Structure 1
Amino acid sequence: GRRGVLMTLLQQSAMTLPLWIGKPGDKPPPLCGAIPASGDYVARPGDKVAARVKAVDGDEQWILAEVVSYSHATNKYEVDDIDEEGKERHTLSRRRVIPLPQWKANPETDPEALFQKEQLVLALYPQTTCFYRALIHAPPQRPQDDYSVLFEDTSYADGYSPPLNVAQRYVVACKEPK
């Protein structure tokens, strides 16, 4: 149905993410893999982001969304919930938005642009459009490889999932408290 097609789309979006190709002696650019955005950065309409949506009852959830607009008067974005189901638009502060990477980091050329083993991240849970807290189990070793992550998961006695695969496009800095 609509959900399965969306997942196909999101998998495709992750695959088509261009690899960053630097030249010798440089630093990988902001939004290459794990490299944070520049200090006063604003994402472009159409850019994908992780957006922290506060439900009416106060529950906080990081979701995948697409930027619609921004205003420096308020320092706020409009974003659209990527599943586009029902009422998809949300107005939220810039600190509630993490831009997704615009390149994959190539593990061969730029390992400094990858999250490392044991690092705390927010990662898109497979077959969802929601980000949750996780630890890196393994960075990709090859250009096309996912991160392997351990999601925090209280349904396991030791509080962690088995290693799950999440693409570079869908792993970002952990801006979520425990």
Structure 2
Amino acid sequence: LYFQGTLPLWIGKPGDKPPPLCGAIPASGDYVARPGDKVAARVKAVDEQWILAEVVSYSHATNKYEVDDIDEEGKERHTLSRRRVIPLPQWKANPETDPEALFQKEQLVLALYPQTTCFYRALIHAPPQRPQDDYSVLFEDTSYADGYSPPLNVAQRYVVAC
């Protein structure tokens, strides 16, 4: 009710690799997202910007997605090369069992910024040590002399490779 789309914790058995789209584990090279899946989509801005979007369809003929920008005003459609679409994780990685499926300190990532529907460049400050905790990240911010925000929390749901 309150937390629509919250991610399940990956629980693997012996000898199971953390799968593609578990935390930091990348999608396979031929991966195709389904209608309804959430993605980071690189679109033209005013400049380009990674936005939170929802897949509408994919054409294997053109290798282009149709995606809808998720905004409060209503949807805007974009047609994008698969090169401009990063699938969001479908599981959160459990640091207690699959710590290697988390982005490590200082890794460059794209992360959702608070009170936006956009992804921006950030460095990992700390991966979570417990499954109930999120990432701490430093966002690039050119308004500050050293170029970075203070540490801000971002759920695994909204941190992807840059």
TM-score normalised by structure 1 residue count: 0.86
Distance 1:28 1:167 in 2: 18
Q: For residue 3 of structure 1, what is the aligned residue in structure 2? A: none
Alpha-carbon shift at residue 87 of structure 1 (Å): 4.8
CA contact 2:109–2:121 (8 Å) conserved in 1: yes
How far is the alpha carbon of 1:25 from its aligned partner? 2.7
Report deviation, 1:80. 0.6
Any idea what the Cα deviations from partners look like across 1:34-74, whole Å, max 9, x if unmatched?
A: 00001100000000000001136xx1000000000000111
Residue aligning to 2:131: 143
Return the structure number with greater helix share: 1
Runs of 5+ consecutive residues of structure 1 not aligned to the other structure: 1-14
Shift of 1:23: 1.1
Counterparts of 1:26 and 1:125, CA distance in 2: 33
| Residue 76 of structure 1, CA deviation | 0.2
Q: 1:65 aligns with which of 53, 59, 63?
A: 53
Give the length in aligned residue pairs: 158
Give the Å deviation of 1:132: 0.5
CA distance in 2, matches of 1:19, 1:37: 17
- Write out the 4+ residue segments of structure 1 that deviate beyond 4 Å after TM superposition: none
Q: What SS does the corresponding residue of 1:132 show, helix, strand or coil?
A: strand
**What is the TM-score normalised by the length of structure 2?**
0.94
Instruction: Quote the Cα distance in structure 2 between the aligned partners of 1:36 and 1:157.
Output: 33
Task: Tell me if structure 1 keeps the 8 A contact 2:6–2:157.
Answer: no
Aligned to 2:99: 111
Cα–Cα, structure 1 residues 153 and 69, in superposed 2: closer, same or farther, change >3 Å?
A: same
Distance 1:173 1:16 in 2: 19
Q: Aligned partners of 2:73, 2:81: CA distance in 1, in Å?
A: 22
Q: CA RMSD in A?
A: 1.2
1:132 to 1:111, Cα distance in 2 relative to 1, 3 A: same
* Uncovered stretches (5+) of structure 2, i.e. residues with no partner: none
Deviation at 1:145?
1.0
Deviations 1:125-152 (A, max 9, x none): 0111100000000001111211000000
